[PDB]
Amino acid sequence: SVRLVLAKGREKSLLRRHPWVFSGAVARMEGKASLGETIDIVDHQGKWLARGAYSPASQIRARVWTFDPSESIDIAFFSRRLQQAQKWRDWLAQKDGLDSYRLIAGESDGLPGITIDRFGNFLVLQLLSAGAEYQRAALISALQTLYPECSIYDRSDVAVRKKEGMELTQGPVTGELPPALLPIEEHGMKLLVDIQHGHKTGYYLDQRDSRLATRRYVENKRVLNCFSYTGGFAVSALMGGCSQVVSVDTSQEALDIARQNVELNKLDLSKAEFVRDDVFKLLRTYRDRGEKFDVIVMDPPKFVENKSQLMGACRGYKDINMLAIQLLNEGGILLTFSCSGLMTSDLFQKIIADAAIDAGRDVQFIEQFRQAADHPVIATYPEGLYLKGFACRVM
Amino acid sequence: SVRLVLAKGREKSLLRRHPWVFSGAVARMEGKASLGETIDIVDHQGKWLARGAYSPASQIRARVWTFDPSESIDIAFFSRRLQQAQKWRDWLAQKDGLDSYRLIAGESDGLPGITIDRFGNFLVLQLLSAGAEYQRAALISALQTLYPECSIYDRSDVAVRKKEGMELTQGPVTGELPPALLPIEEHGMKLLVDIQHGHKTGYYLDQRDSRLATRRYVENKRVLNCFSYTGGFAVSALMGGCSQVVSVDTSQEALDIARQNVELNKLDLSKAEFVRDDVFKLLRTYRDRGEKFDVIVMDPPKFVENKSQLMGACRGYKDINMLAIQLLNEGGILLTFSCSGLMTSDLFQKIIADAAIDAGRDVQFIEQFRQAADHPVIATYPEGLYLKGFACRVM
């Protein structure tokens, strides 16, 4: 019904099949549409370009559902998209021994604003854009048809929804309520996730390969895992045969789950330590007395200057990575990460390089990490790559 | 005791410990030094900053040997550098099942302009810069001392030398002459290398992880290996249990070695096809008749449009990757690479994305490749990262 007319020239992004239409590229709206309503997007002359979801409260005024002129956005549309995404995850599950994975990664699976993670028999939703919420009913119907035995839970309690003009929301959608802790599997390893209250959708599936890579580096080595959360990296270190792994986190609850994870995998508790403390404080205490480690995993949360898209300068990263380098033996390996929207892979690299200079030690980049394969990045949406990380060796 | 004086406020690079000192930064040469000779680098006030090698014919007027005031560059200097580098490769070889690897990766192992590859009991040199050649005797002494039972061969037939004011050179140094083909091991796989007349030093050790990843995607799938050369990818595909692997190359010699690698590993020859033909032609032939593959490996030769870092701007990568995408079905995977300093990782990504649009299909980036860990990149030398690659899934 309603159409969004692009300003002359401003249709280049659509021709590149980019899923987003910024408010600034819109010349006018022909007709009135509701929040999240399906609209057609045409060029300044009126030629059809795509069919998307209208988002009046957002700067991303519309997101593209499809570039096929004959494709309506209804239950069938979502069913087809789910089936296409499932084909990929079926292969990944078999190959990597997975019982859980991200099923739809928004724009990269052709469903902008929608994220769905599979955890055992639970499907966890995060409807982050206006279009996602508007199509909630259709999406659910498709999900119930394709995954009749699965329970659906909503974890749309993400601040980004405010950018789309919607309230945050979460809770059961269908089926049974998830347990406090649900065991999932990855690469012959079991991990407990909290769907109702855990981070994101319940866990960080995106760090799957970083965790697996940890196994290769830790044989008979002393490991320090900073901001360990529920200990995914700790279990991975033990699976790799580390002599000892020290997990540090500010949350006792997370550390308790970490210990439950070690026990669940029948690993050696004697080789694992769980320290509840201000990470920065612990790191300085260790450094001041000369503590040394062979492998250090560094994966901090909101860089500190979070949300500070403006006044970023969140060089809490330099301090954290500098401390890490100072705690490494010669030949020590640092696996450090960042998912902050205030920095790119290149800028993250410069920070590490700078931390090395101040620490008085040179480091070699020997590996670059990426979000797992169930978090694909469609080529038309490079911004989709958010997880940055490197494996560094102290010379 | 000749010194290279830097223009005021132009020593910031040395302060970041970057190994290169460009001509534009040189204020004046206080003294007369021969090509490759050891010299001191100072600021406008005469303060010592580093000790490097002079290269009058290059844009890179000097490369830093050391930033340690008391460190002289002699046999002991190279001996210590070789031992420090060997420490890392000993760990990598045992971990990844290697009897061959890059021992010294120039700047990244504190020896700018020097590259040394180890193939079994052979050490292959490549002295690319003025300083590398000038220090040949000292480097050789350290080597014969640390590796008394290894033969040394020189493969300094690299165009880079001309840009440093030298002529190309290659041939034996000490020990026995390498055999026509020498079998090496990596990840439980055997490959044949030609040290005397093969590409580079005799093989592409840097693609080790690319070959490994090829194994993950090919079980029960039809594979197309473009620019197979002496094999490597064809064997990897078979090691992964591919249903069929077709290798294309214009060189009958390379194809003969590819097949030899297959037999050497006792793999099913009945699943391997070797086609001698123009890769571009065969690709259009397959495209024209609707041939389809499940996985395609695309590792083009030397840029094709090299003729300088900037002489690139050639859409040969674009055209070649477009053909590949047209040869895949939904779910098909493209493993495509670039080693030319003719483009960054982001530029290569752009090309694939463009190839995708012209092909009329979307592709998902699910994995990113880089030179193997024995080809480290010191944080002070970002330009050290030259190998780029992506695993792309056709939607």
Curated annotation (Swiss-Prot), chains A, B:
Pfam families: Methyltrans_SAM, PUA_3. It comes from the Bacteria. It is found in: Cytoplasm. GO terms for molecular function: protein homodimerization activity; RNA binding; rRNA (cytosine) methyltransferase activity; rRNA (cytosine-C5-)-methyltransferase activity. InterPro entries: PUA, PUA-like_sf, PUA_sf, RLMI, RlmI-like_PUA, SAM-dep_methyl-trfase, SAM-dependent_MTases_sf. Keywords: Cytoplasm, Methyltransferase, RNA-binding, rRNA processing, S-adenosyl-L-methionine, Transferase. The keyword Membrane does not apply. The keyword Transmembrane helix does not apply. Its EC number is 2.1.1.191. PROSITE patterns: PUA. SUPFAM superfamilies: PUA domain-like, S-adenosyl-L-methionine-dependent methyltransferases. Residues 1-80 form the PUA domain. One of its GO terms (biological process) is single-species biofilm formation. It is an enzyme of class 2 (transferase). It catalyses: cytidine(1962) in 23S rRNA + S-adenosyl-L-methionine = 5-methylcytidine(1962) in 23S rRNA + S-adenosyl-L-homocysteine + H(+). GO terms for cellular component: cytoplasm; cytosol. Its main location: cytoplasm. Homodimer. Belongs to the methyltransferase superfamily. RlmI family. Specifically methylates the cytosine at position 1962 (m5C1962) of 23S rRNA. Methylation occurs before assembly of 23S rRNA into 50S subunits. This is Ribosomal RNA large subunit methyltransferase I. It comes from Escherichia coli (strain K12). The lineage of its organism: Bacteria, Pseudomonadati, Pseudomonadota, Gammaproteobacteria, Enterobacterales. The gene is rlmI.
